[PDB]
Amino acid sequence: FREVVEILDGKTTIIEGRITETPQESPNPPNPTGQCPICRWNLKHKYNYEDVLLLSQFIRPHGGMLPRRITGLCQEEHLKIEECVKMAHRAGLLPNHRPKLPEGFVPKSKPRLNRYLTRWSPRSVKPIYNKGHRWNKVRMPVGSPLLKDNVSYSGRPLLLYH
Amino acid sequence: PPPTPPQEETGLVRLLRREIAAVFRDNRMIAVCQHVALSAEDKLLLRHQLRKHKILMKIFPNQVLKPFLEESKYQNLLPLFVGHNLLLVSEEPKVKEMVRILKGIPFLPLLGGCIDDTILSRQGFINYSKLPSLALVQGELVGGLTFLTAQTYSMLQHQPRQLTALLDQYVKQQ
Amino acid sequence: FKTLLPVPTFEDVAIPEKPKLRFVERVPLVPKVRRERKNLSDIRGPSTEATEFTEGRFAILALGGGYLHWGHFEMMRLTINRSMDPKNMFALWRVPAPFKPITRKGMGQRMGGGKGAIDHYVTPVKAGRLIVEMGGRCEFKEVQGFLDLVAHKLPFPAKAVSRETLEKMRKDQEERERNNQNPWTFERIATANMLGIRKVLSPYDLTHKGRYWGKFYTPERV
């Protein structure tokens, strides 16, 4: 991994780039002939928002996603993993993947409400005051429709709107 | 993925390959310079100054120049042909006036090139420009070869010249 | 660096005289004096006429059924004439002039008393029929761009198709209807009268195969 460092010594600015050692892929994948990382490690339709050990492999230390041209995922798996990382960040997993603000960490605010499988952003959804009748019911979306192809061991489909 | 669908060569890339081959085969001085983004009026001015000394500039796509270069005997020019490129092509390599006219523009750096199958850097080009003419050096090689016999004759004739100079200084003393 | 591809050249196409769309009359030269019933079968079902290209290369395809009257005709004519190039493009109709009389009654009239009075004329259009057909030495991108407006302003759903796009969509429909996975199809069940479904179905459903419902047409319904 490359790091950009700045040195200030008497109105002289030195910008330097330092390369450190990075971990590599595990030596024995279960499906070596697969072109995609997930689809060759056999994690397709297997991960979720809880699998932080997989979602944290390719994200920036400030919680941002990594480009597909650099990672190598197929487009659908990239979108799925992006939505899963969003849902994990909203649910509260990956707490060390946030920027450190020493000036903003002191003014504590209202306690964080616990949530999970959050599809939209908490600051953009409006409360459903009408809620509809039985025939026209305003259903509340839960989870993402991109994870509708995951393996269902119980056989029942996932209720994406409830 | 399925096997490779081999892409077929077209007339444009054939023309480009043939032109690059003709350039690398016919002329002698092949200088590589960085294609700097200047005003087209200044580009035309440099083109005029180049055609004054009968040297031309060419621009070829990397996609057709890199494979030809790594297939030919010019594989040592690969670190030069990555970014923007300018091929200074000329018969009768005369680097003196070339470096003279390139010195006027400060931020147009000479990358390198080849002088008669001799790959040189900027310092090599400067040294070749400062080097005398081929006629001068081939006339001076004969002198440097016969210099041994010349100094032998001078040192065998210096013995009477020593006494001669002794007599001259003794005369000049008074 | 990108390769230089050749451009399509049109020399065999001939632009005929009067390439613009001709004016259509609101009422035919001989008005129908006898009032006719509103047969909705001229809207129901698939189109049998004007389903293929005659001389042009692009057209406006109707994915549903409806009525075209003088307002629609004038809209299409004006838009196409003002957005076309008469030196390189020509257009022609594929639907006749409004001929079917539509009767109306005054406001405040009670039910009964007889038939109303002929208000205006319409042109019945079924699903899958071409409305305007264009050709010339032009490409499809510009024609599609300026024909999507007319296709949207038409009553029924419509698309700006060409020969290639029409054949592509028909072959795609064939591929879907041939590689469908579930063994139960509307055509099979209706033809075999499985579960006694003919009691709720219609005698025209045996030919519509569940793709046409009234005046609407669902092209993704096999």
Next chain:
Amino acid sequence: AAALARLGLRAVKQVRVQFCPFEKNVESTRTFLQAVSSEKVRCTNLNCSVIADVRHDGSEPCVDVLFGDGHRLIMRGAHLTAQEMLTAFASHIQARG
């Protein structure tokens, strides 16, 4: 080049890019030179001196900017991206000057 032209480079005296074109890590520095020596960057200020030092055995490509605030920005670019160097140089120029 456009981001530099829209910055008002009038407050810079000398910019020298010293590199060796026969290396494997001079791509970013060469593009930095071509971006800082564009026509728009030339015409936005004519008092600036842009030098391109070409060596063969230096093996350490770097850039040096001395601008009239008495300020010296020195960046030894061996692994930095051209975009990162451009943004750093632009932010520093707009911060001091």
Next chain:
Amino acid sequence: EALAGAPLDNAPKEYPPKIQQLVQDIASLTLLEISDLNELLKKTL
């Protein structure tokens, strides 16, 4: 076959062996051969 390495003047210490081998072919011959060499070189060049 390939091209040269194109060295610079920073650490220039290796000369091509041809200019040394010509010096050895020069220094391995006699004075009559030196006379023939410079007479031939003076007539041709």
Next chain:
Amino acid sequence: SGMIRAIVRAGQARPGPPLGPILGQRGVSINQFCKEFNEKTKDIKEGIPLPTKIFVKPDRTFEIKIGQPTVSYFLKAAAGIEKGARHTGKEVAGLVTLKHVYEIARVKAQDDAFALQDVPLSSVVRSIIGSARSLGIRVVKDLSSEELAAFQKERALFLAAQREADLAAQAEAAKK
């Protein structure tokens, strides 16, 4: 400030638009520019137009660079017509010989464009031929003894009929 292109007459440099407001907004005065232009082109036949480039500097100073006259003017003069043809390709305006084209190319080669471009006279002759094709002037190989006048008579009759037809169309549009 920047460069300004302007096709100005030889000695007819008026201090009004379409050159007054531009130089005034740039900051340079107009009377000084007109004086300089007239003293620089006093040796030129007053009336013929030529392109020039005015480089206005940030200190409200200006320099002038005058080039060769317009190719359209050269062709109109060599053909003997005052105004070009309206419908190029369908009608013929004048008749110019390749000799006249070569002379025009030789006189025009000493300009900014063909000076910055080291190019033989062949491409300049090609440019003159293209400009003549745009103007509507035909270029015959070797045909000028009296058929030039024979075509000039027909051209004058055509221009007279065209003027009468234009007046008739104007009157029709007026009474309609």
Next chain:
RNA sequence: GCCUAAAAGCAGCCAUCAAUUGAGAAAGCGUUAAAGCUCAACAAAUUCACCAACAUAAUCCCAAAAACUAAUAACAAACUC
């Protein structure tokens, strides 16, 4: 090139040629007219990139809730044993 007060790629009509490795008498903004900002062409790279999203009524919203422990389950009639 004509028209026009001005018509400079761009109210309009006609041609649509010409050098450069490479740039349309110009496909969009802009000026009274220029200027100026883009698009396409070379040189620099090359993740994917065609259409698809659309407010509302009056007494008070309207079961509560729930995305994974195995389901051609189970519970369910005046039907049938």
